[PDB]
């Protein structure tokens, strides 16, 4: 017996659990960021209305300008959320999609193994059918049993060889999933991290431009 498969299947099923956990948390983060961009849009509108209701020209000017800043920020929030979901949240779903591919491989290995075991059970009935005919007085039917045994002798040989190859594919698939991870994971992470760096850079410039407008309030 080989424990590697029974063990590796556990590591795979466990990693998929940690992926769905982090994925579900990200989905709430995307929605919460979308929810924030909406509230920011509402606030930006209320600010412009406040600036109009104002009777102080300077305050109306500053307030109106502040609303414009918030108007730009709410867009960054939405694009950030969109970048969260697509870059970060679709990054997770893909791996969960690949993990399920290796799970199906383990499941397919058990299938081939089951059919291989089912063939073994079919062969015994053949040998037993001949044992009963050995005492009978019909050489024709006897050769009929000896032939079906020969045929099924090769059948189980085929299913056994299939199980060996299928067991090798799962091994080849797991290694492929691991090598592909370390090769592209780092870049995919940097891609998203840059999406957050761009947002922060935009936020700063937004406020650095409004700061002089705030000081200019007389």
């Amino acid at each position: 017996s080989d424990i590697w498969f029974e063990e590796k299947l556990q590591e795979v099923e466990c990693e998929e659990q940690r992926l769905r956990k982090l994925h579900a948390v990200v989905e709430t983060l995307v929605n919460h960021r979308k929810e924030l961009a909406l509230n920011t849009a509402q606030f930006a509108k209320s600010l412009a209305m406040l600036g109009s209701s104002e009777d102080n020209t300077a305050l109306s000017r500053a307030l109106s300008q502040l609303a414009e800043v918030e108007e730009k920020i709410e867009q960054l929030h939405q694009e950030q959320a969109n970048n969260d979901f697509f870059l970060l949240a679709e990054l997770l779903s893909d791996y969960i999609r690949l993990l399920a591919i290796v799970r199906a491989a383990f499941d397919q290995r058990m299938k081939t193994w089951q059919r291989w075991q089912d063939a073994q059970a079919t062969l015994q009935k053949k040998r037993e059918a001949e044992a009963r005919l050995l005492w009978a007085n019909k050489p024709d039917k006897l050769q009929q049993a000896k032939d079906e045994i020969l045929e099924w002798e090769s059948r189980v040989t085929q299913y056994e060889r299939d199980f060996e190859r299928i067991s090798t594919v799962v091994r080849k698939e797991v290694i492929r999933f691991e090598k592909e991870k370390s090769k592209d994971f780092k870049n995919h992470v940097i891609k998203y991290l840059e999406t957050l760096l761009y947002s922060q850079q935009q936020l700063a410039k937004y406020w650095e431009a409004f700061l002089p407008e705030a000081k200019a309030i007389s």
Binding site: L36, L47, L66, L193, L211
Partner: protein
């Protein structure tokens, strides 16, 4: 004196504009802390996911989970400062408007008192009392306007500085992380 007339309409209208922008600012800040919560919740799943995994990447996950643990700190900070500078400012002057409103209400009351004595004449004190209030009222209302312009400019400047502070902080935080991975 039409000053107290236009002032009445302005205060009534501005209060609704102030109250509206107050609840909107609160909702926005509260939504900020929500995103901040997901930051620590995400860094946890990242840290817990990096445990069982090849060592090559395993260290990479611990660097992003550590990054989110810090980013959650800045998001919770910007939400707090946002509540203090904006929501609190709108709060303060939502009640300050109610106070100025009460002043106008009292002044008009003393006005009708003088208006009554103005239709009879020996107690013209309602006239002296009406002017003692009309003068102090206009003196305080103008004092309010001047204090409101300084408060808005003061908070608007401070908020801009804080926003720039956290923005640069997150930029450096992210920057170091990206530059770290780019140069493994």
């Amino acid at each position: 004196d039409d000053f107290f007339e236009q002032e009445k309409n302005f205060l009534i209208n501005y209060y609704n504009r102030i109250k509206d922008s107050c609840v909107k600012a609160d909702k926005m800040t509260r939504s900020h802390k929500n995103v901040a919560d997901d930051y620590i919740h995400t860094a946890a799943c990242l840290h817990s996911l990096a445990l069982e995994e090849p060592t090559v990447i395993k260290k990479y996950l611990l660097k992003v989970a550590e990054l989110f643990e810090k980013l959650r700190k800045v998001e919770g900070r910007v939400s707090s400062d946002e509540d203090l500078k904006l929501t609190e400012l709108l709060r303060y002057y939502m009640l300050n408007i109610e106070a100025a409103k009460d002043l106008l209400y009292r002044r008009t009351k003393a006005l009708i008192d003088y208006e009554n004595s103005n239709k009879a004449l020996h107690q013209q004190e309602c006239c002296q009392k009406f002017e003692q209030l009309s003068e102090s009222a206009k003196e305080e209302l103008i004092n309010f306007k001047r204090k409101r312009v300084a408060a808005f400019r003061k908070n608007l400047i401070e908020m801009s500085e804080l926003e720039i502070k956290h923005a640069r902080n997150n930029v450096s935080l992210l920057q170091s992380c990206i530059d770290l991975f780019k140069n493994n």
